Amino acid sequence: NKVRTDKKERKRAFPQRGFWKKQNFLQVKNNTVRLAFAVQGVDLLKLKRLRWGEVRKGNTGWWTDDYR
Amino acid sequence: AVPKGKRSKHKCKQRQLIYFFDQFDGVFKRRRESFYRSFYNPPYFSKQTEQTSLPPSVLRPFRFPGFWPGRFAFKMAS
Amino acid sequence: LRETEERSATRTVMCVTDFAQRPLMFLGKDDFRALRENLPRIKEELKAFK
Amino acid sequence: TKHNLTYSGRVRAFKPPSAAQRWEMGESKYAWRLPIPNLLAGDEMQLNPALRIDESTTQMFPDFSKPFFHNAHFNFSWKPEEVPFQQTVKLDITPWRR
Amino acid sequence: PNTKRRIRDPFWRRSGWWRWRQQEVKAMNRSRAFRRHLFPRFTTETVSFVDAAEAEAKRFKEIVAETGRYPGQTVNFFVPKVEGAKLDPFAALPSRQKRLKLRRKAVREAEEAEKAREDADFVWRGKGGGRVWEERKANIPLGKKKLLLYCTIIKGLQITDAIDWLSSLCLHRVNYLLNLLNASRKKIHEQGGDISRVYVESYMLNIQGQIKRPQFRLRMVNLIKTWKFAVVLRFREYPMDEYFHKLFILKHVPRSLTTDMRLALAGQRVGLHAVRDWYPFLDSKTRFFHRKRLKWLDRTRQFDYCLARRVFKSKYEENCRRRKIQVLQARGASDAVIEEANL
Amino acid sequence: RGIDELWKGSYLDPTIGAKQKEANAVAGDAWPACLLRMK
Amino acid sequence: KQGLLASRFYRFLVISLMEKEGTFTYYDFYVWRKGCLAYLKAAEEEMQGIRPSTSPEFKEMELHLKILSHFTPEELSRDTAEHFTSAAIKNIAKAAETSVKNVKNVLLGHAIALTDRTWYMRLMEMQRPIPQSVEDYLLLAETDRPYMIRLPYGEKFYNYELEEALAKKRASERHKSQRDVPRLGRKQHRIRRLFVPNARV
Amino acid sequence: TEPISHMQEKPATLRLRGLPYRTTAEDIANFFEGYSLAGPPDEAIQLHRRMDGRPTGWASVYFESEQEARRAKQDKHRSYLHGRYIEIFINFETGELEWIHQPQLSENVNRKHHGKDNR
Amino acid sequence: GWSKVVNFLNKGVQRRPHRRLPGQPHHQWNMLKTQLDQLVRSDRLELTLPRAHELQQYAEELVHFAKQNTPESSLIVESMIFTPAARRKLFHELCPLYANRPFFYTRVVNQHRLRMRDAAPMAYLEFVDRPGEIRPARPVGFERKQAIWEEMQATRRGRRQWWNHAKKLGLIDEETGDVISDINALRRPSAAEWEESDSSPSPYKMVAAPKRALEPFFVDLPPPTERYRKQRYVFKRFDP
RNA sequence: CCUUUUAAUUGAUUAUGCUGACUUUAGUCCCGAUAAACUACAGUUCUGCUUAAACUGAGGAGUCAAGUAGGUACAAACCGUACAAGGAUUAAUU
C-alpha cells in the first residue's frame, strides 16, 4: 500500500529474473485514451513523440521534410 | 559444512589479486578490445533515443591536438 | 497558428482498398473504361487458366 | 476526454439506461412516422431514423432466407415476421435410452 | 569465448613461481626496465621538485613539538585537541586542497619563469612534478571488493584511456566512476590543464556505510546490505619533459592516442607524411624498432636527448597554438583581437 | 445568473486578463471596529 | 498609438516563432530575431511617417544578431547548448566584442524559444487560447508551461533554461533556516513561538 | 603537393554512404554536378576499398570550401544514385573539442522495471 | 563466478551444430519461423550475435527452396513461412532479385558493442543486395563477367590473375589470344526480366521514379511505415 | 601541584554475558511458468486459456476485503477519482 504498512517488501529482498509487463492491457488503455483525444482532433501520440522545440502541424514529420 | 576458522587478511588480499587477474583476463581485456575495434565504424545510433540524442554522425574525433599535423578549423566565410 | 496551405482537389480517381480501407491501387476513367472494354476476354482467360 | 474515460481505477464504465431509453417518458421508436411530430419538424428536422445510419459502422443488408446475424440491423428484442420460420432444437439429454 | 585463452595467476605458474624464482625473475625485470631508459649525456643542472606548503607545515609542527609553543609565542603554550573542542590547534596551516592549489600556483609560476631562463633546455628534472588535482565522489552503491577491481584497472593510465576502459565494461554501477572521470576531465580542461598529459596517479576508497534490509527466511531473519562508498582520485598533469621521456623514450603511449592515430591513417584524414611523423608511437612493432634505432644512435653518440626533447616540445606546442589560432579565426575575429589573445 | 459571482473577476475567471485580475485583486483595509460601531 | 503597435508586435513575435516546422536551430533563431528586428524598424518607419531604434531593447536585439553572426555554421545547425564549451563562449565574446554574459543571454533566449515552441505546439494541438501579452504569458507560465521530458533508465534530459533556473533556485534556497518552520515530527519551541515575530500576520 | 592524399592540409570533405557496387568516381562527380570540387574527379573523389579492392560502399568527396561542402550536403542528402538514396556526413572537426562535454550517465538504471530496447 | 571454469568445463567438448533457443523444440521452431518471417518483411534485423548466426541458415534455406519453383519446394517454403506479406515479398522481390545468385543471400555483421541493459553482444542479420545494405553486394552472372573483364583490362596484373578463370568464363578470344572487345556479346536474358513474347499523353500517366512508379496526384497519407503507429512501451507502474 | 578525605560502590583478554559497530564464510547460495516485431512502398508473429456486451420497459444475479489495490509524464512523487433524478433534449453551438 501507499502507507507502506503491508509486508510486500519481504519478497523484494530476493532476486527475480524478470517481471510481466502487462503490455496488452496497458496498450488497450492507452489506445482508449488516444481515441478519446482523437475524436476531438488531438494527436496525443504525436505530441508525446515530439522533440524539444519541435513543431509539427497536422500529421507531418520526416517524410514531409523529405518530400517537400 | 562450515569454516573451522576465520580467513586472514593476508589470504583475503591474495584472493583479491587472484580474482582481479581472473576477471581481467576473462572479461575486461576482451570487452576493451571489442570496444576499441568498434571505433572503425560509425557510432551506434539508437532509434529509441532520437527524441533527445544528437543527429547521426560518422566522424570520430582526434582527441590529442598536440599530435595533429593538419587543420583544426576552417576560416570564416564571407 | 492553425492556418495551413490551400490545395486543389480536382483529380477524379477511383481507389481500391482492402477490408481496412488501406489503399491498393488508383485508376482513372480511361483505365476503368479500358478494363471494362477488355472484360469479356478476361473471363475466357480465367476459364482457360482454371 | 469527457465521459469516454474513467478517471479512477474503474476499468469498465457503468451507466444506467438513459431517460430516452426508458419506456415511460422515453422516445417511441415509431413516433417519427406520426403526423404531429412531422408537423412540428417543418424543414428544421428530419425524423426518419434511416438518415442517421453511420455508413462506416453498419453492414450491407443480408438475404433473410440465408444464415445471418440478428445484431446487424434489427436493434430490438424481437424477431421480424419477414425472417422465415426458425427451427427450435431441444437437447437430447439421454441418447443411450434410445 | 576462446575456451583455450591463457588466464594469468600472479602466484603460481607451470614454469615454476616459487619465491626464489620470483626473486630472480623480478631482478631480471628490474634490470630490463632500467636499461630501457635513455639518459642525456650532458646537462647543466639537476633541478628537483619541492613543495613549499608541505615543508612549512612540517617545520611548523616540528617547532610546536620542540618548543611546546607556536612559532612566535613567548608567554602561552600550545594546546592539543581534546574531546569536544571546537578549535583546531593547526588552523593557521593550509588544508590539503589549499596545499594543492598552492602547488598549482607554484607550478604555473615556475613554468612562466622557465621561459626566460638561459640553458633551460639542458636541465634534468625527474619523475615528480606538475599540477595535481584531487576529486571526490560519494554515495556510490558499490563495495570495496568491486571498487578495487575497477580502480586497479585504471590506476596509472591516461584519463581518456581510463574513460575508454570503464566505458567498455557495460556495468551499470561503473557509471558513477565514469561520471567522476568525465567531470574531472572537464574541470581540468576548463582550468587550463592539458588533458593529453593528465594521468590517474592514485585512488583512495572511503567507506560511508551500509543500508540494511530484512530478509525473511524459513527459520531466521537475515539482513542484506547495500554499500555506501566514496572514491577519491588523484590526477596529475605531467610536465612536458616527463611526457617526452615517457612517450618518446620509453614508448609508454596511451592506447587511445594510438587508436586515434590509426583511425586517422585508415580514414586518410591526414597526409602521407603522417606515417613517418607518427612512426615512433603508432604500433607495437614500430615502437620496438624505433626504440632499437634510438638505442643504436645513442650508443654511437649521434642521438641528442636535449635536441630531441626540444623538437618534440616545440612540435607539440606549435600544434596546440595552431589549434587556438585557427579556432579563433573560424569566428571572424579581428587581427587586433587575435594578437591580444597571445599576450 | 448569480452563481458566477463565486469566480467573476478573480484569478479563476477565464474571460479576463492578468492585468484586470491584478487590479481586481488589489484591496484596502479591513473595517475598523470604531467605524463599525457607528452603523 | 503605441499600444496597437506593441500588441501587433507580440502577435507577429508569436506567429513568426511558430512558423518554422521541425527542429528549431540557432539559424532559425537568428532568422526569427531578424524578422522581429525588421518588424520593429518598419513600425518605426510608420511612426515617423505620420523611438524604437534608440531603445535599449532595440540595441540588445542588435547585439544578439551580432553575436549570432559569429557562430560557425555547425553551431548554427545545432539545436541545443549542450556542447558549447566555456572556451568557445569566451572566444565568441572576444570575436563579437561583447561579454560572456551577453553570449549566455543569447543561448538562454534560444532555450526559452525552444520551451515556448513546445508549449505553443501543445496548446495549439489541444485548441486552447494562446496568451496574447507578456502579462498573460507570465501568469500562465507559472502553472502550465512544460519544462522537461521524463526518460527511462534514469538518463538525464537537457534543458539550458532548467539548468540555470535550478542553479539559481538552489542558490536562493540554500541555508534558509528551518528553525521556526513547523515540520511534522519535530518538536517545537513554544516560548520562541510566543515571542519571536511571525511575518505571516 | 598536388595530390590530396599528399597535402598536409586537407580541403573540406564529405562522406557518402549507401553506394552500390556499380558506383564509380565519374558517377559521384555527376551526382555532385553543379558543385565545386577541390580538383579533378580522380583526386576529389576517392572510393574506399578493402585489401582485395572490393568496394566498401563508402566514399570521400573533397570540395573547395566548407561553404560549398555544406551546400552540397544540404542539397544532396538523401538523394538517389543508382536506385539507392545516399546519406552524406560532414567528416571534419570544429576544433572546439566537444567530446569533453559528455552527458551525465544514469545512476538509477532500474533495468528490470523498464521497457525493452537495444540501446 | 570464475572465468577459467569455462575453459575447464569445455576441455574436450564439441560445438553444437544448432544453437538451442529457450523452451521446447516446437516453441524453438515457431520462434525461428516467426523471426524468419519478420526478417523477410524487414530486410534486416538487429539481433544478438548467436541468434543472427542461428537464423541465417533458415533464411538461406528459404531463398534456396523458393527459387526452385516446384510444388515440393513451394510446400517446403510454406512450412517455413507464416504471413502473406512475407510470402509476397519473398516470391515477388527476393526471388527475382536473387535469380542469378547461386547461394549466400544473407550476411551477419557483428556490431562489436554490448547491449546496455543486459550486456548482450549485438549484430545485424540482413538480406544482401537490397537498398540500405550495410555493405555493397558483389555481382553475379553477366555482371560478374563484366566486372572481371574490366579488372582484366585495367592492369596487366589483373589479366594474369584472371587469365585461367577467364577462359572458362568465355572472355578470352581464341583467334587472337587476347581478351574480347565487345563484352555485350555475352549478354543473355535473365529469369528476372519479363520475356517479351507479349510483343504517354494520358492525363494520368505514371511518372518514373527509382523504386516504384508514382501517381500524378497527391494523397494526404504518410508512408506505410508511418501510417499506423502506437507507443512502443506503455509504462507499468510500480505498486508499493 | 602537594596534603587530608571521598559511600567511587573506583581497575575487565573470558560469564554460549548485555547493548551495538564492524570482519570471515564470499563476491559464494539465492534470479518463479513462453516468448517476437514495430519495418527503404498494402496486410494477418507464435503460444496458454476461453462468459469478452457495456439500454433495448428489468441498476445490467451476490457477499466480503482493499481504513480508497488497475487515474496520471517510462514517477515506489504532486494533483485527481464511488453523484440512485446519471444531468450533453449536445439531432445543440460552429
CA G192 to C1' J20, whole Å: 37
State how far the Cα of D37 lies from the Cα of D32, in Å rounded to an integer: 6
Task: Let me know: does A50 contact B50? Beta carbons within 8 Å.
Answer: no
* Residue G144, helix vs strand vs coil: helix
Q: Is the dihedral of CA E225, E226, E230, E235 positive or negative?
A: positive
No. of H helices and E strands in chain H?
3, 5
Dihedral (Cα; E291, E292, E295, E296), 10-degree rounding: -150
Distance from CA of I23 to the nearest CA of C (A): 36
And the C-alpha cell for I188? 543473355
CA B67 to C1' J37, whole Å: 47
Instruction: Say whether the CB atom of C39 is under 7 angstroms from strand J.
Output: no
- CA-nearest of G35, G21, G42 to G64 is G35
Distance from CA of G197 to the nearest CA of E (A): 32
What's CA A30's distance to the chain center, in Å? Answer: 7
State how far the Cα of E289 lies from the Cα of E294, in Å rounded to an integer: 9
Task: Let me know: does I80 contact I33? Beta carbons within 8 Å.
Answer: yes
State how far the Cα of E98 lies from the Cα of E100, in Å rounded to an integer: 5
Helix (H) or strand (E) holding I45: strand I44-48
Cell 580467513 belongs to residue? B7
Which residues on B lie below 8 Å from I226 (Cβ)?
none
Q: What is the largest CA-CA distance in chain B?
A: 83
Q: Which chains reach chain G with 3 or more Cβ–Cβ distances below 8 angstroms?
A: A, B, C, E, F, H
Task: Let me know: does E283 contact E289? Beta carbons within 8 Å.
Answer: no
- CA-nearest of H118, G161, G23, G82 to A50 is G23
- G163 burial class (0-12, 13-18, 19+ CB within 10 angstroms)? middle
Q: Is the dihedral of CA E241, E246, E249, E255 positive or negative?
A: negative
State how far the Cα of E6 lies from the Cα of E127, in Å rounded to an integer: 35
Partner-chain contact E224 A13, CB within 8 Å: yes
The number of beta carbons lying within 10 Å of the beta carbon of residue I75 is 11
State how far the Cα of H68 lies from the Cα of I57, in Å rounded to an integer: 47
Using a 7 Å cut-off to protein CB atoms, list the covered nucleotides of chain J: 22-47, 54-60, 66-77, 80-82, 85-89, 91
* Residue E4 near chain B (CB below 8 Å): no
Which residues on B lie below 8 Å from G158 (Cβ)?
52
Q: Which residue of F has its CA nearest to G134?
A: F18
State how far the Cα of I55 lies from the Cα of I36, in Å rounded to an integer: 7
Distance from CA of I70 to the nearest CA of C (A): 18
And the C-alpha cell for B42? 560509425
- CA-nearest of E55, E40, E210, E214 to E141 is E210
Instruction: Say whether the CB atom of I233 is under 7 angstroms from strand J.
Output: yes
- CA-nearest of E155, E143, E169, E140 to E233 is E155
The answer for residues whose C-beta is within 8 angstroms of residue G201's C-beta and 6 or more apart is none
A55 forms beta bridges with G22
Which residues on B lie below 8 Å from A49 (Cβ)?
51
- CA-nearest of E168, E23, E267, A13 to B59 is E267
And the C-alpha cell for H73? 550536403
Chains G and D touch (3+ CB pairs under 8 A): no
| Backbone break loci in chain I, preceding residues, C–N > 2.5 A | 199
And the C-alpha cell for D51? 438518415
Which residues on E lie below 8 Å from A10 (Cβ)?
214-216
State how far the Cα of E64 lies from the Cα of E89, in Å rounded to an integer: 10
CA F13 to C1' J82, whole Å: 30
Distance from CA of A27 to the nearest CA of I (A): 6
State how far the Cα of E40 lies from the Cα of E42, in Å rounded to an integer: 6
Task: Let me know: does I61 contact I104? Beta carbons within 8 Å.
Answer: no
State how far the Cα of E164 lies from the Cα of G68, in Å rounded to an integer: 35
And the C-alpha cell for E135? 576529486
State how far the Cα of I58 lies from the Cα of G56, in Å rounded to an integer: 72
Task: Let me know: does H62 contact H39? Beta carbons within 8 Å.
Answer: yes
CA D59 to C1' J9, whole Å: 103
State how far the Cα of D22 lies from the Cα of A52, in Å rounded to an integer: 51
Degrees to nearest 5, angle at CA I142 with I141 and I144: 65
State how far the Cα of E174 lies from the Cα of E231, in Å rounded to an integer: 12
Cell 557483428 belongs to residue? I110
Mutate to test the interface with B, among H58, H93, H119 (most CBs of B within 10 A): H93
State how far the Cα of E40 lies from the Cα of E307, in Å rounded to an integer: 10
The number of beta carbons lying within 10 Å of the beta carbon of residue I148 is 20
First to last CA, chain H: 45
Task: Let me know: does H55 contact H16? Beta carbons within 8 Å.
Answer: no
E205 forms beta bridges with E231
And the C-alpha cell for A37? 483525444
Instruction: Say whether the CB atom of G157 is under 7 angstroms from strand J.
Output: no
State how far the Cα of I25 lies from the Cα of I33, in Å rounded to an integer: 12
CA distances from I30 to G34, I25, I58 (A): 61, 9, 12
CA distances from I155 to B35, I160, I162, I178, I183 (A): 39, 9, 11, 14, 17
I37 forms beta bridges with none
Dihedral (Cα; H17, H21, H26, H30), 10-degree rounding: -50
* Residue C30, helix vs strand vs coil: helix
- CA-nearest of E94, E113, E114, E112 to E52 is E94
Partner-chain contact I4 B38, CB within 8 Å: no
Beta strand H55-62 with H13-17: parallel, antiparallel or unpaired?
Answer: antiparallel
Q: Which residue of B has its CA nearest to G70?
A: B76
State how far the Cα of G98 lies from the Cα of B2, in Å rounded to an integer: 74
Report helix, strand and coil shares of chain B as percent, to nearest 5: 50, 0, 50
State how far the Cα of H93 lies from the Cα of I91, in Å rounded to an integer: 46
Alpha helices in chain I (DSSP H): 4-10, 25-42, 49-68, 71-80, 84-89, 95-97, 142-154, 156-169, 224-227
And the C-alpha cell for G35? 524578422
* Residue H47, helix vs strand vs coil: strand
And the C-alpha cell for H70? 555544406
In the 42-81 segment of chain H, residues within 7 Å (Cβ) of strand J are none
Which residues on I lie below 8 Å from C30 (Cβ)?
202-204
Partner-chain contact E3 I116, CB within 8 Å: no
* Residue A5 near chain H (CB below 8 Å): no
Task: Let me know: does E316 contact B67? Beta carbons within 8 Å.
Answer: yes
- E91 burial class (0-12, 13-18, 19+ CB within 10 angstroms)? exposed
Q: How was this structure determined?
A: cryo-EM
* Residue C6 near chain A (CB below 8 Å): no
- E96 burial class (0-12, 13-18, 19+ CB within 10 angstroms)? exposed
CA distances from I225 to A61, H59, I221, I228 (A): 12, 29, 11, 7
* Residue I61, helix vs strand vs coil: helix
Degrees to nearest 5, angle at CA E200 with E195 and E202: 155
> Amino acid identity, residue H55?
P
What's CA H6's distance to the chain center, in Å? Answer: 20
Task: Let me know: does H16 contact H88? Beta carbons within 8 Å.
Answer: yes
State how far the Cα of D83 lies from the Cα of D64, in Å rounded to an integer: 6
Distance from CA of E218 to the nearest CA of A (A): 13
The answer for residues whose C-beta is within 8 angstroms of residue I228's C-beta and 6 or more apart is none
Task: Let me know: does B77 contact H66? Beta carbons within 8 Å.
Answer: yes
Distance from CA of E149 to the nearest CA of B (A): 6
Q: Which residue of A has its CA nearest to B55?
A: A51
CA D16 to C1' J60, whole Å: 8
What nucleotide is nearest B16 when CA is compared to C1'? J27
Q: Beta-strand (E) ranges in E146-271? A: 198-216, 221-237
The number of beta carbons lying within 10 Å of the beta carbon of residue G66 is 15
> Amino acid identity, residue E186?
K
Resolution (A): 2.2
In the 106-135 segment of chain I, residues within 7 Å (Cβ) of strand J are 130-132
For residues G110-145, one letter each, b for 16 or more C-beta atoms within 10 angstroms of the residue's C-beta and e for the rest, the string is: bbebbbbbbbbbbbebeeeebbeeeebbebbeeeee
CA E199 to C1' J31, whole Å: 40
I125 forms beta bridges with I45, I108
* Residue E8 near chain B (CB below 8 Å): yes
CA atoms within 13 A on the CB side of I234: 16
Task: Let me know: does E39 contact E249? Beta carbons within 8 Å.
Answer: no
Beta strand H13-17 with H84-89: parallel, antiparallel or unpaired?
Answer: antiparallel
Task: Let me know: does E188 contact E132? Beta carbons within 8 Å.
Answer: no
Task: Let me know: does C11 contact I217? Beta carbons within 8 Å.
Answer: yes
The answer for residues whose C-beta is within 8 angstroms of residue C6's C-beta and 6 or more apart is none
Partner-chain contact E185 H100, CB within 8 Å: yes
State how far the Cα of D16 lies from the Cα of E181, in Å rounded to an integer: 64
For residues G2-23, one letter each, b for 16 or more C-beta atoms within 10 angstroms of the residue's C-beta and e for the rest, the string is: eeebeeeebeebbebbbebbbb
Residue window 4-23, chain G: list those with CB within 8 Å of chain A.
Answer: 18, 20-23
State how far the Cα of G31 lies from the Cα of G76, in Å rounded to an integer: 11
Which residues on A lie below 8 Å from H111 (Cβ)?
none
- CA-nearest of A30, A64, A26, A59 to A43 is A59
And the C-alpha cell for I219? 494523397
> Amino acid identity, residue E199?
Y
In the 35-74 segment of chain D, residues within 7 Å (Cβ) of strand J are 45-47, 52
CB pairs below 8 Å between A and H: how many?
6
The answer for residues whose C-beta is within 8 angstroms of residue I219's C-beta and 6 or more apart is C23, C26
Q: Is the dihedral of CA I17, I23, I24, I26 positive or negative?
A: negative
> Amino acid identity, residue G114?
L
Partner-chain contact E214 A10, CB within 8 Å: yes
What's CA I85's distance to the chain center, in Å? Answer: 16
- I131 burial class (0-12, 13-18, 19+ CB within 10 angstroms)? middle
And the C-alpha cell for I237? 507502474
Beta strand E132-140 with H55-62: parallel, antiparallel or unpaired?
Answer: unpaired
Partner-chain contact B50 A52, CB within 8 Å: no
CA E81 to C1' J6, whole Å: 31
* Residue I184, helix vs strand vs coil: helix
**Which DSSP symbol is given to B56?**
P
Instruction: Say whether the CB atom of D8 is under 7 angstroms from strand J.
Output: yes
**Which DSSP symbol is given to F6?**
G
H16 forms beta bridges with H59, H88
* Residue G86, helix vs strand vs coil: helix
Task: Let me know: does E38 contact E299? Beta carbons within 8 Å.
Answer: no
In the 175-204 segment of chain I, residues within 7 Å (Cβ) of strand J are none
For chain C, give the DSSP string: -------------EEEE-TT--EEEEE-HHHHHHHHHHHHHHHHHHHHH-
Helix (H) or strand (E) holding B12: helix B9-23
